RNA sequence: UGGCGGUAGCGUGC
DNA sequence: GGAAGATCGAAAAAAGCACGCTACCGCCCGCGTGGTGG
DNA sequence: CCACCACGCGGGCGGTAGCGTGCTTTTTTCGATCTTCC
């Protein structure tokens, strides 16, 4: 049909002709020429050549490029035949059937809103007004403000106060589907309740960020508006963020503090040695908080508080036990936000990221799902507030260089020099001396890292009430490394200790390692050596994204028609699962 | 050393101890000079247009009586300059006129002497010229042609690492890559056979090529093998034995000579036997008759008695054949020396598998392989073979190609013919055989010494040569077609092919990219870019891992950190600061020669190939006085690896520490403290910062800002020294010095600054004067600051006060908290200029015209429009407003241009383009009047200066005749010239001066006439359009949540909240912080450079605050001088020395005024200030050395529990604005084919629900949501209408219907001859 | 958007999908090599019937 | 306001 | 001892190369042939 | 008599030939041996 091959009207009177029209014209011209020559009784060779050319034209129209030279376009491109636009990524199946552009959709960058709840997301007023235009029109017509669609459109365009009130009314509990571009798994799209904000950026709940794999460094996300009762209820009951707390891949929880909540909780749940107000006796967590706020007791002071904890009875009831516990002011303050069922032992520790995740999992297992979201929200609020109050900062003096690094470097260099001179004397070959140098440098790097960790983790000294003693370090870098907020042991080693050996792009290791810290300067040679690994990793990621996507698509297709259609088969067969053991470990 | 005038205003405190031995060269030298090589009149035909003409011309027709020859070429004066070409949208180019001589030979004469000659000048198209900033103006748009890194022509040897044949065996191959010709490849078969391929076709034996080169089997065997002589003595077959040939084999018999049994039967041959043989000097040896049976004969042997050959050449011997040879009278035979480890019999096996046996057969086979189907014949095959590799037309090995070919083959001379030869192919085969045997080694494809750089000039020359060969084919046809009685060379040739080729190359090529004008750094990076893509290069998808890696040879030539991230990573690079290009296209880097253990001053430029031979010491090497090395075992790099060496083994030293970084990567302070990935991201994101309305100098810099700003064309530099005669916000007029004066010149330089002109990224280009009235200037001094430039220093961002601490989770991972002061102080607002073009065409029904009256519109809509139908300049408009009123006949329908929805701003510029022969509206008249007024103002200034000079001369002449001071002063200025005088030479000189004055007046009048004619000249347009109206809209965009900002260390984020000023934390003095950042991003990203930059900025701001406080108290100049001298003298053996005693006591005041905002600090890329220097600088001010103070919470009030890191950091605003990304749609236009919503924000389309989203919805189980989003939202037209009506009616129900895309697919499949239908049953 | 047309070919032409897409349907049905099918189709060699 | 090709950029283990 | 099934490696042909989004440029046959005007 | 504008009908482009040339995996076919027998 002509509309499937339309003639686009261009400016100036020209017409854009699709490749299908050109191929059809070629076929028609060839057929007419063949008919005319057959009428004229042409010799055998001429009519045979005409028939061959007609066959070639028909083949090109049906599927261009299959045989012989493909018919070229205006600017030396193959023409798009009938089969060219059916298959492939740009074909009809993968461009207009599996996926398609939709209405009632928008796109905007995403920021962080700490005040939002787990089921709430910020939506700009302009985007909400644009997306919910038909609903506003319907409500305006119902209210009698506008007697026709044109009047409603004009009123919405003019943006009076009544329009804003109607917009606020229509999105009271209307979920919106927020989705990110790399939808690797089902968690990439989730339903949220919109909260009207002014601006042009969507506000996202921090706790779901790990689910979205989204960083606030220019990320853009799309929002779709479900527009029927079935879709609204499906979003509320199935794709709501409050219902997605366990990862279907492995069952591990997905709502976990990542960077700031963990640091705040770790700082609050930490004990000093001679902090202000130590040794006091408190009647409850409320007194502890009123002491901390009044600036009369430190957050790390070790005190004894009388607290009541609720334990779940066998029949399902809660029994209250009151006892005096030796703890810190911060732990007592944090205990109040903990629900009744949980015991006090969860918060009586440093409470790192793993401890926080374990506490959340225990709360979900014992209390259930309804208190779990409230507990997570309270945890995030308290962590953010106390991280702000702590004022943790990174400085050039935080990353301390061990005083024994110079001696270790000197002795390693002396050993390398003696190995080199022994090789020059002919006792050992190139491979043996290379292996010896590599082992010596690896041992030196390990010793440097160990000395750095020893000097950073606990080398702090504090004067208690009477003498001096040691304790866990309060260094900011160590604080965020031990709590699991950010960084790791290797990263801290690269910052303060030696960078270690580096490998050339081929794969072999370089004899001379980078013996310079990141705090200290790196000369040109060390930076040039280190650039190889970064370039290799970046290239690997760039060429790996496409392969991972292709594998995911193939796996999705190979299992696209498997659903649970039965309850039991009565089969007496199965796999005999046993623990897996390889070598000398399980 | 004396500071320049532009530097004395604000001297940057420069850290670093390594003296500057070589200054940074001109950044835009790779491009400009190259194009100069394309334009310069070469006395010899080896470069550019002259070389192309000499290669093509002269041409001889088929008949011997015709000839055409080329004499000289000349590039004409461009009609329009760069500014006119840019504003009018025409291409900036120059005419090319070539002197051509057509010679008609005397055909009647047997010798064909010259009979007639006709010389003329022929115009041969337009050549696009290159502007002074290294960029082209194509169709009024700025385009940049990036250099291409391609494979160097020559011979390259390689081998697969056992991947093929699935056993790990290496198949060695060699390739001959010519600049213009057919590729020739040789490969080793798994069966150890030589094969030859041409242009990647089916493999053929190389012996076929050898036979086609007129080589017999005997000659081939002699060339590729060493003969072994077997002589038939009276007995025991004495043979000439070479002891070295006995190595690596076994004792087939009892080797005994002169009654001495050297080796017994069946014993392995060890080196002792060969050394014994060499010492004893034994030549002849006994050999059993059976031992020959394994040998292969070397040449044909024919019996004289029978006349028939007993055995031909190259086959294995046998006992019966040996007996036949012995009884035929033969006494001496020759065989091939074959070894299984040293000299393999590859040639013999290839000859065995070769079916051909003569030159004619080989030529026929080659012709059949090259041109299948055509009937082979002797003449055609011979011609094809001769023209394939031995014709200057079809085959052309470039000079660099010949040099590489000679160097690879170890030839002495590096100059040779541009075509191949028998010796070259023989040597290539011999080298391949040697490599297969074990001698030598393969070449590295990724080695930078095997890769060439092609600039714009080379590609332009290639395209011009293609056009030239097309034109010469046309002229060859025309000369024979026509009769030479009356032909003229003007009409003999055509210029369309050359013009089309050059236009396509300069406008529609993969390397002529759209130049980005985000900031001068972006332009510099784009101009200094190397791309491996393009024609005759690598492919983005088919690249691999090896090509994207950082080769060791990249040191000093290609920046390792400056490269795009994503699909094309490692295929695009940036030239180093000091890197340049050889005459052969190879990259080279400077070095300092070291003689006798000391470092000299001479600079030697070393390429990649020759650098490996020498030992080069790293830049970070401590040197004492006179250049000796303080330490003996210094670190160097010998051959692609780094190791320790003695101080006497060094040969060259690095020129500077910035040798390996690019221009973009050298602007990051404390780079050595930053991770490679974060450094790469920061370098890539530096060139994306939009220019702010008020440029702010960087407190912490690297000292390269001045070079980047000066080299880029954004700033206006002084061509000649002098004083500023008249400084204005729009133009600058300076009076040149008498030393730099020229004869017959007024001596006034006029610079017209460009104000509020949109860039390629819709930003604002503004130039503001940086000099005052009467301020002396020198050559090269900056007169006006370009966009994002402050006093000649690049200024991409602003020095913002920052504090590293979490704040209620608002910063969280990467988000940025911004105080309200940043918005209040207007520190990040940008200006964006947008085009709006309305076209009045000529429809077939009638010509549409622009008028002020539009049917069925309100008066308020056209109130902004004037009586000419165009919106008033300076009038603020919003979305939906009418700008230009255009109506087209149907009686007339409204087609007036309107402001796009969601777009506001103020109209700042209106341009009208009218086709020639059409009356011009009064708006165009006003614009032309304004341009004429400006030109007349400039010419009137020049005329008044020259007239003042002439009238001073005539006054002096009159005074010489007679003083008449009172009479002269009491006379009008113009009446002076006519005053009479006595009959003498005074009257003669007076009338000569009058003649000069009137001649000058006439000359300036005709110059004004030419200028006005040029400005009023009608411009050509497209066919069918009679008018164009362009309107510029200017918008001030302010910072807000969602905008993306970043620093120089790869730390990026988006604004999360515009916090109130009182909410931000404040110090003891009560000054709040402006920016709050999360420390959590520091340890993970390794970017400790930002912390050091923050500390240095805090120290600089403390110094500036002390200076400002001293200034406020009106302290005497002595205290200011002492304090500034103490501040500058701080450091540890810094190379920079500043003396304030020679500042005339007045420039100190200006320096203090400039520094009151903060002392600038220059931190080199690898020779920066240490932590001790930063702490000392902090101690100089009244700031703590630790760099952390105690902050108070703005909202709550008490002290923070721990000190926080505060300071001043350079922040950049990237070109990613939230208002440019925000988009929403409920309903709108749909595609006319698939009936689906459009795509993109510009088309008001909807977001695409891809396959991954569909899979996620299926996993969730939301069947109804998927069904409604698939059918009733996108495709089902009836479903869409019904759903809209239901929503308007308040009913939330839908009808699934049937998507239109499925119907389209069904119809398309039916059109394919396949019946597909829906079966209801 | 639904009505289709038809062109009456002067001589029959084979479908490229059923001829070139390996395995060739025509060749498999006729038990003859694909090269012979291409030779007869594009007027290179006669075929007995 | 309709699409193709080329180019460049953004978000994608820190 | 010649013909048919085996096979075997080597070569040739076909299909694929993540997902969203933004901006710019270029193009949307074209060339001979007849009509008509200066 | 020459130059600009409209209109219809083929098709690789342009040339008295040649243009290409940095991927991997799977499927099909074919010459060449082979090998196994009837
Ligand atoms: Mg990100």
DSSP per residue, C5-20: -----SS----SHHHH
CA distance A120 to A114: 11
Superfamily designation of domain B576-656:
DNA-directed RNA polymerase, beta subunit, external 1 domain (2.30.150.10)
Nearest residue to A536 via CA among A513, A503, A565, A559: A503
Instruction: Note the CATH number of domain B657-713+789-828+1038-1221.
Output: 2.40.270.10
* Residue A6 C-alpha, separation from nearest chain C C-alpha, in angstroms: 10
CA distance B1201 to B1192: 10
Is A121 annotated as contributing to ligand binding?
Answer: no
Judged by a CB distance cut-off of 8 A, whether residue C15 touches chain B is yes
Three-state DSSP at B1260 gives helix
Q: How was this structure determined?
A: cryo-EM
Q: Is B714-788 the same fold as B576-656?
A: no
Angle among Cα A438, A443, A445 to the nearest 5 degrees reads 95
Nearest residue to A294 via CA among B1198, B1064, B1065: B1198
CA distance B440 to B415: 24
Q: CB of A33 under 7 A from strand F? A: yes
**Chain B, 1190-1219: which CBs lie within 7 Å of strand D?**
1216
Sheet (strand B782-785) strand order: B716-717, B782-785, B768-769
All residues at 6 or more sequence positions from A402 whose CB lies less than 8 Å from its CB, including other chains: A448, A451, A452, A455, A496, A497
For tokens 């603020």, what's the residue?
B876
Q: How far is the CA of B675 from the centre of ligand 1 (A)?
A: 17
Q: How many H helices and E strands in chain C?
A: 3, 0
**Chain B, 430-449: which CBs lie within 7 Å of strand E?**
none
Q: CB of C35 under 7 A from strand F? A: yes
Q: DSSP characters for A34-89?
A: HHHHHHTT--HHHHHHHHHHHHHHHHHHHSTTSSSSPPB-TTS-B---TTTTTSST
Maximum CA extent, chain B: 135
- CATH architecture of the domain covering B829-918+1019-1037: Beta Barrel (2.40)
Give residue limits of the domains in chain B: 26-152+445-575, 153-225+344-444, 226-343, 576-656, 657-713+789-828+1038-1221, 714-788, 829-918+1019-1037, 919-1018, 1236-1321
User: Do the Cβ atoms of B1215 and B689 come closer than 8 Å?
Assistant: yes
In strand F, the nucleotides that come within 7 Å of a protein beta carbon are 9-23, 27-30
CA distance B661 to B1164: 11
Three-state DSSP at A135 gives helix
Tokens of B304: 């004289």
User: Do the Cβ atoms of B251 and B360 come closer than 8 Å?
Assistant: no
Nearest residue to A294 via CA among A305, A283, A286, A302: A286
CB contact under 8 A, A391 and B1269: no
Q: CB of A66 under 7 A from strand E? A: yes
* Residue A101 C-alpha, separation from nearest chain C C-alpha, in angstroms: 21
Judged by a CB distance cut-off of 8 A, whether residue B1242 touches chain C is no
Handedness of CA B798, B803, B807, B813 (dihedral sign): positive
Q: CB of A531 under 7 A from strand D? A: no
Q: What would the 3-class secondary structure string for B307-330 be?
A: CCEEECCCCECCHHHHHHHHHCCC
Tokens of B439: 């001698």
All residues at 6 or more sequence positions from A377 whose CB lies less than 8 Å from its CB, including other chains: A117, A118
Q: What are phi and psi of B81, to 5 degrees?
A: -80, -175
β-pair partners for B1036 = B831
CA distance B149 to B376: 41
Query: Which chains pack against B, by 3+ Cβ pairs within 8 A?
Result: A, C
Handedness of CA B1158, B1159, B1160, B1163 (dihedral sign): negative
Question: For the packed helices B29-39 and B48-56, what is the interaxial angle rounded to 10 degrees?
Answer: 40
Residue B1104 vs residues A71, B5, B98, B584, B699: alpha-carbon distances, Å: 72, 22, 63, 51, 10
Q: How far is the CA of B1096 from the C1' of D2 (A)?
A: 56
In the 8-state DSSP scheme, what is residue B1019? P
Pairing of strands B798-804, B1075-1077: parallel
Q: How far is the CA of B502 from the C1' of E26 (A)?
A: 14
CATH classification of B919-1018, choosing from 1.25.40.10, 6.10.140.1670, 3.20.20.30, 3.40.50.620? 6.10.140.1670
CA distance B309 to B323: 14
All residues at 6 or more sequence positions from A135 whose CB lies less than 8 Å from its CB, including other chains: A170, A174, B1287
User: Do the Cβ atoms of B124 and B96 come closer than 8 Å?
Assistant: yes
Is A103 annotated as contributing to ligand binding?
Answer: no
Tokens of B603: 């600079």
Cα A263 from chain centre: 19
CA distance A309 to A341: 8
CA distance B819 to B1074: 5
Q: What are phi and psi of B794, to 5 degrees?
A: -65, 135
Tokens of A63: 């599927």
Pairing of strands B1044-1046, B886-889: unpaired
Tokens of A561: 């028609």
Tokens of A213: 């794999």
Three-state DSSP at A461 gives strand
CA distance B584 to B40: 18
Tokens of B374: 């055509």
CA distance B1191 to B1212: 25
What count of residues does chain C have?
49
All residues at 6 or more sequence positions from B617 whose CB lies less than 8 Å from its CB, including other chains: B594, B634, B635, B636, B645, B650, B652, B653, B654
Tokens of B937: 């103002």
Three-state DSSP at C28 gives helix
Nearest residue to B1140 via CA among B1158, B1157, B1152, B1156: B1152
Nearest residue to B821 via CA among B798, B794, B790, B791: B798
In the 8-state DSSP scheme, what is residue B19? -
Tokens of C18: 């059923």
CA distance B1268 to B319: 91
CA distance A534 to B560: 10
Angle among Cα B936, B941, B943 to the nearest 5 degrees reads 90
User: Do the Cβ atoms of B518 and B689 come closer than 8 Å?
Assistant: yes
Q: Is residue B601 classed exposed, middle or buried when 0-12, 13-18 and 19+ CB atoms within 10 A define those classes?
A: exposed
Cα first-last separation, chain C: 43
In the 8-state DSSP scheme, what is residue A509? B
Q: How many CA atoms lie within 13 A of B545 on its CB side?
A: 13
All residues at 6 or more sequence positions from B929 whose CB lies less than 8 Å from its CB, including other chains: none
In the 8-state DSSP scheme, what is residue B562? -
Cα A222 from chain centre: 16
CA distance B577 to B589: 9
CA distance B806 to B809: 6
CA distance A192 to A110: 14
Three-state DSSP at B1060 gives coil
Q: How far is the CA of B1052 from the centre of ligand 1 (A)?
A: 9
Tokens of A288: 């502890």
Residue B1207 vs residues A395, B975, B1092: alpha-carbon distances, Å: 11, 70, 10
User: Do the Cβ atoms of B486 and B112 come closer than 8 Å?
Assistant: no
CA distance A24 to A58: 9
User: Do the Cβ atoms of A119 and A240 come closer than 8 Å?
Assistant: yes
Question: Other C-beta atoms within 10 Å of B310: how many?
Answer: 17
- Whether domain B714-788 has CATH 3.10.310.30: the reply is no
Tokens of B1278: 């009836």
Q: CB of B132 under 7 A from strand E? A: no
Nearest residue to B1094 via CA among B679, B695, B671, B803: B803
Sheet (strand B849-850) strand order: B849-850, B886-889, B892-894
Angle among Cα B1228, B1233, B1237 to the nearest 5 degrees reads 25
Q: How far is the CA of A127 from the centre of ligand 1 (A)?
A: 23
In the 8-state DSSP scheme, what is residue C42? T
Helix (H) or strand (E) holding B122: strand B114-128
CB contact under 8 A, A54 and C11: yes
Residue A419 vs residues A219, A231, A412, B375: alpha-carbon distances, Å: 53, 74, 11, 73
Helix (H) or strand (E) holding B991: helix B985-1016
Cis amide leading into B58 (omega within 30): yes
User: Do the Cβ atoms of B979 and B958 come closer than 8 Å?
Assistant: yes
- Whether domain B153-225+344-444 has CATH 3.40.50.12280: the reply is no
Nearest residue to B1097 via CA among B1163, B1145, B1034: B1163
Residue A149 vs residues A154, A233, A264, B357, C32: alpha-carbon distances, Å: 9, 28, 54, 92, 70
User: Do the Cβ atoms of B781 and B722 come closer than 8 Å?
Assistant: no
Q: Is residue B938 classed exposed, middle or buried when 0-12, 13-18 and 19+ CB atoms within 10 A define those classes?
A: middle
Tell me, in Å, the resolution of the deposited structure: 3.0
Pairing of strands A281-282, A189-197: unpaired
CA distance B1028 to B913: 5
């Amino acid at each position: 049909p002509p509309d499937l091959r339309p003639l686009v009207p261009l400016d100036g009177g020209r017409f854009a002709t699709s490749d299908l029209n050109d191929l059809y014209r070629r076929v028609i011209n060839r057929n007419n020429r063949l008919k005319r020559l057959l009428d004229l009784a042409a010799p055998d060779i001429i009519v045979r050549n005409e028939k061959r050319m007609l066959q070639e034209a028909v083949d090109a129209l049906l599927d261009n490029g299959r045989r012989g030279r493909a018919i070229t376009g205006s600017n030396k491109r193959p023409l798009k035949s009938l089969a060219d636009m059916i298959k492939g990524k740009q074909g009809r199946f993968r461009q207009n059937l599996l996926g398609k552009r939709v209405d009632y959709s928008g796109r905007s960058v995403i920021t962080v809103g700490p005040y939002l709840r787990l089921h709430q997301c910020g939506l700009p007023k302009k985007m909400a007004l644009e997306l919910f235009k038909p609903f506003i029109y319907g409500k305006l017509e119902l209210r009698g403000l506008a007697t026709t669609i044109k009047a409603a459109k004009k009123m919405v365009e003019r943006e009076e106060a009544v329009v804003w009130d109607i917009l606020d009314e229509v999105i009271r509990e209307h979920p919106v589907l927020l989705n990110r571009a790399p939808t690797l798994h089902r968690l990439g799209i989730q339903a949220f309740e919109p909260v009207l904000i002014e601006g042009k950026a969507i506000q996202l709940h921090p706790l779901v960020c790990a689910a979205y794999n989204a960083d606030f460094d220019g990320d853009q996300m799309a929002v779709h508006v479900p527009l029927t009762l079935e879709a609204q209820l499906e979003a509320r009951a199935l794709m709501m963020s409050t219902n997605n707390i366990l990862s279907p891949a492995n069952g591990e929880p997905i709502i976990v503090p990542s960077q700031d909540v963990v640091l705040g909780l770790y700082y609050m749940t930490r004990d000093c040695v001679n902090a202000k107000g130590e040794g006091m006796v408190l009647t409850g967590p409320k007194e502890a908080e009123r002491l901390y706020r009044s600036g009369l007791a430190s957050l790390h002071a070790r005190v004894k508080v009388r607290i009541t904890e609720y334990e779940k009875d066998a029949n399902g009831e809660l029994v209250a036990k009151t006892s005096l516990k030796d703890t810190t002011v911060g732990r007592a303050i944090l205990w109040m936000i903990v629900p009744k069922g949980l015991p006090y032992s969860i918060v009586n520790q440093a409470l790192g990221k793993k401890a926080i995740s374990k506490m959340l999992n225990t709360c979900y297992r014992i209390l259930g799902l309804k208190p779990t979201v409230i507990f997570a929200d309270q945890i995030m609020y308290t962590g953010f507030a106390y991280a702000a109050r702590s004022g943790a900062s990174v400085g050039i003096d935080d990353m301390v260089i061990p005083e024994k690094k110079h001696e270790i470097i000197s002795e390693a260099e002396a050993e390398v020099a003696e190995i080199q001179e022994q090789f020059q004397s002919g006792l050992v070959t190139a491979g043996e001396r290379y292996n010896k140098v590599i082992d010596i440098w690896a041992a030196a790097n390990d010793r440097v890292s160990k000395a750095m960790m020893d000097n950073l983790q606990t080398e702090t000294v504090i004067n208690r009430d009477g003498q001096e003693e040691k304790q866990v370090s309060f260094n900011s870098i160590y604080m965020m490394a031990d709590s699991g907020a950010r960084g790791s042991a290797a990263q801290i080693r690269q910052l303060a200790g030696m960078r270690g050996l580096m490998a050339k792009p081929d794969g072999s290791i370089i004899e001379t390692p980078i013996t310079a810290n990141f705090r200290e300067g790196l000369n040109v040679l060390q930076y040039f050596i280190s650039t190889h690994g970064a370039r290799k990793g970046l290239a690997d990621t760039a060429l790996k994204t496409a392969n991972s996507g292709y594998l995911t698509r193939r796996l999705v297709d190979v299992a696209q028609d498997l659903v649970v259609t039965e309850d039991d088969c009565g089969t007496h067969e199965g796999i005999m699962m046993t623990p897996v053991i390889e070598g000398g470990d399980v | 050393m004396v500071y320049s005038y532009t530097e004395k205003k604000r001297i940057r405190k420069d850290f670093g101890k390594r003296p500057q031995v070589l200054d940074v060269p001109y950044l835009l030298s790779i491009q400009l000079d190259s194009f100069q090589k394309f334009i310069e009149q070469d006395p010899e035909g080896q470069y550019g247009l002259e070389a192309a003409f000499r290669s093509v011309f002269p041409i001889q027709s088929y008949s011997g009586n015709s000839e055409l020859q080329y004499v000289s070429y000349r590039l004409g004066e461009p009609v329009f300059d760069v500014q006119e070409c840019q504003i009018r949208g025409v291409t900036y180019s120059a005419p090319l006129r070539v002197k051509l001589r057509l010679v008609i030979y005397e055909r009647e004469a047997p010798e064909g002497t010259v009979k007639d000659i006709k010389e003329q000048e022929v115009y041969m198209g337009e050549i696009p010229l290159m502007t002074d900033n290294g960029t082209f103006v194509i169709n009024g748009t700025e385009r940049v042609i990036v250099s291409q890194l391609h494979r160097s022509p020559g011979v390259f040897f390689d081998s697969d690492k056992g991947k093929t044949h699935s056993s790990g065996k290496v198949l060695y191959n060699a390739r001959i890559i010519p600049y213009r010709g057919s590729w020739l490849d040789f490969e080793f078969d798994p069966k150890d056979n030589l094969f030859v391929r041409i242009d990647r076709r089916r493999k053929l034996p190389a012996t076929i090529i050898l036979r086609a080169l007129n080589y017999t089997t005997e000659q081939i065997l002699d060339l590729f093998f060493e003969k072994v002589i077997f002589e038939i003595r009276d007995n025991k077959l004495q043979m000439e034995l070479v002891p070295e040939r006995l190595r690596g084999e076994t004792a087939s018999f009892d080797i005994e000579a002169n009654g001495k049994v050297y080796v017994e039967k069946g014993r392995r041959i060890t080196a002792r036997h060969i050394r014994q043989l060499e010492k004893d000097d034994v030549k002849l040896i006994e050999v059993p008759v059976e031992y020959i049976a394994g040998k292969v004969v070397a040449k044909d042997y024919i019996d004289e008695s029978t006349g028939e050959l007993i055995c031909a050449a190259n086959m294995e011997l046998s006992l019966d054949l040996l007996a036949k040879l012995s009884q035929s009278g033969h006494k001496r035979i020759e065989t091939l020396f074959t070894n299984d480890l040293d000299h393999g019999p590859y040639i013999s096996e290839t000859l065995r598998v070769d079916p051909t046996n003569d030159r004619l057969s080989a030529l026929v086979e080659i012709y059949r392989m090259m041109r299948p189907g055509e009937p082979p014949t002797r003449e055609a095959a011979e011609s094809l073979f001769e023209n394939l590799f031995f014709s200057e037309d079809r085959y052309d090995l470039s000079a660099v190609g010949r040099m590489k070919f000679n160097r690879s083959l170890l030839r002495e001379e590096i100059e040779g013919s541009g075509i191949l030869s028998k010796d070259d192919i023989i040597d290539v085969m011999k080298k391949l055989i040697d490599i297969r045997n074990g001698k030598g080694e393969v070449d590295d494809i990724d080695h930078l010494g095997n890769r060439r750089i092609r600039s714009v000039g080379e590609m332009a020359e290639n395209q011009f040569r293609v056009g030239l060969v097309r034109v010469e084919r046309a002229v060859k046809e025309r000369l024979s077609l026509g009769d030479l009685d009356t032909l003229m060379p003007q009409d003999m040739i055509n210029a369309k092919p050359i013009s089309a080729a050059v236009k396509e190359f300069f406008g529609s090529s993969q390397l002529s990219q759209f130049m980005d004008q985000n900031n001068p750094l972006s332009e510099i990076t784009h101009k200094r870019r190397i791309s491996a893509l393009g024609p005759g290069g690598l492919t983005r998808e088919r690249a691999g891992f090896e090509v994207r890696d950082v080769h060791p040879t990249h040191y000093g030539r290609v920046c390792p950190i400056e490269t795009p991230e994503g699909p094309n990573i490692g295929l695009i690079n940036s030239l180093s600061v000091y890197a340049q290009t050889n005459e052969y296209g190879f990259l080279e880097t400077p070095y300092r020669k070291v003689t006798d253990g000391v470092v000299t001053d001479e600079i030697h430029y070393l390429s990649a190939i020759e650098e490996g031979n020498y030992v080069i010491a790293q830049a970070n090497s401590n040197l004492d006085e006179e250049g000796h090395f303080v330490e003996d075992l210094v670190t160097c790099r010998s051959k692609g690896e780094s190791s320790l060496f003695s101080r006497d083994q060094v040969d060259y030293m690095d020129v500077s520490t910035q040798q390996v970084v690019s221009v973009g990567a050298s602007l990051i302070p404390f780079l050595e403290h930053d991770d490679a990935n974060r450094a790469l991201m920061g370098a890539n994101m530096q060139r994306q910062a939009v220019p702010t309305l008020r440029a702010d100098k960087p407190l912490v810099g690297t000292g390269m800002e001045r070079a980047v700003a000066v080299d880029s064309g954004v700033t206006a530099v002084a061509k000649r020294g002098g004083v500023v005669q008249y400084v204005d916000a729009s133009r600058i007029v300076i009076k040149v010095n008498e030393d730099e004066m020229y004869p017959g010149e007024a001596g006034i330089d006029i610079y017209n600054l460009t104000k509020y002109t949109r860039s390629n990224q819709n930003t604002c280009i503004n130039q503001m004067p940086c000099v005052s009235l009467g301020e002396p200037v020198e050559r090269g001094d900056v007169l006006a600051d370009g966009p994002s430039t402050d006093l000649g220093e690049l200024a991409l961002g602003q020095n913002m006060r920052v504090a590293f601490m979490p704040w209620n989770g608002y910063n969280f991972e990467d988000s940025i908290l911004v105080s309200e002061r940043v918005v209040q102080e207007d520190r990040f607002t940008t200006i964006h200029i947008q085009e709006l073009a309305c076209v009045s065409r000529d429809t077939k029904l009638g010509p549409e015209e622009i008028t002020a009256d539009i049917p069925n519109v309100g008066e308020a809509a056209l109130s902004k429009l004037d009586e000419s139908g165009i919106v008033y300049i300076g009038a603020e408009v919003t979305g939906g407003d009418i700008l230009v009123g255009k109506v087209t006949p149907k009686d007339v329908k409204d087609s007036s241009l309107r402001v796009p929805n969601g777009v506001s701003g103020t109209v700042i510029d209106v341009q009208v383009f009218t086709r020639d022969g059409v009356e011009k509206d009064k708006r165009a008249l006003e614009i032309e009047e304004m341009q004429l007024k400006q030109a007349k103002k400039d010419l009137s200034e020049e005329l008044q200066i020259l007239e003042a000079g002439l009238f001073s001369r005539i006054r002096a002449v009159l005074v010489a005749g007679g003083v008449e001071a009172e009479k002269l002063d009491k006379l009008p200025r113009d009446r002076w010239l006519e005053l009479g005088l006595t009959d003498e030479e005074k009257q003669n000189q007076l009338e000569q001066l009058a003649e000069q004055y009137d001649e000058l007046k006439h000359e300036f009048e005709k110059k004004l006439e030419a200028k006005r004619r040029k400005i009023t000249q009608g411009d050509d347009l497209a066919p069918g359009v009679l008018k164009i109206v362009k309107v510029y809209l200017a918008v001030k965009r302010r910072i807000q949540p969602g905008d993306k900002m970043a620093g120089r260390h790869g730390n990026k984020g988006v604004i999360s909240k515009i916090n109130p000023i009182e909410d931000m934390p404040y110090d003891e003095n009560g000054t709040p912080v402006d920016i709050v950042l999360n420390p959590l991003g520091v340890p993970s990203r390794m970017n400790i450079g930002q912390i050091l930059e923050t500390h240095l900025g805090m120290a600089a701001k403390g110094i500036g605050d002390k200076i400002n406080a001293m200034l406020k108290q009106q302290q005497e100049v002595a205290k200011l001088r002492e304090f500034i001298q103490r501040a500058y003298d701080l450091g540890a053996d810094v190379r920079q020395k500043v003396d304030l005693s020679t500042f005339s006591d007045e420039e100190v005041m200006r320096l203090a005024e400039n520094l009151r905002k903060g002392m600038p600090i220059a931190t080199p890329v690898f020779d920066g200030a240490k932590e001790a220097e930063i702490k000392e600088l902090l101690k100089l001010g009244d700031l703590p050395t630790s760099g952390q103070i105690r902050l108070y919470d703005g909202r709550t009030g008490e002290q923070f529990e721990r000190p926080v890191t505060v300071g001043y950091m350079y922040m950049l605003k990237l070109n990613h604005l939230v208002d440019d990304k925000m988009h929403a749609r409920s309903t709108g236009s749909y595609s006319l084919v698939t009936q689906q919503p459009l795509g993109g924000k510009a088309q008001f389309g909807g977001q695409r629900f891809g396959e991954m989203e569909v899979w996620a919805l299926e996993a969730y189980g939301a069947a109804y949501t998927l069904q409604e989003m698939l059918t009733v939202k996108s495709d089902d037209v009836n479903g869409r209408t019904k759903m809209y009506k239901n929503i308007v009616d308040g009913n939330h129900q839908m009808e699934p219907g049937m998507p239109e895309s499925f119907n389209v697919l069904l119809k398309e499949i039916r059109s394919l001859g396949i019946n597909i239908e829906l079966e209801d049953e | 958007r639904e009505r289709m047309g038809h062109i009456e070919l002067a001589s029959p032409t084979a479908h490229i999908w059923f001829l070139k897409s390996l395995p060739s349907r025509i060749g498999l049905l006729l038990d003859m090599p694909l090269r012979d099918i291409e030779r007869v189709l594009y007027f290179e060699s006669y075929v007995v019937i």
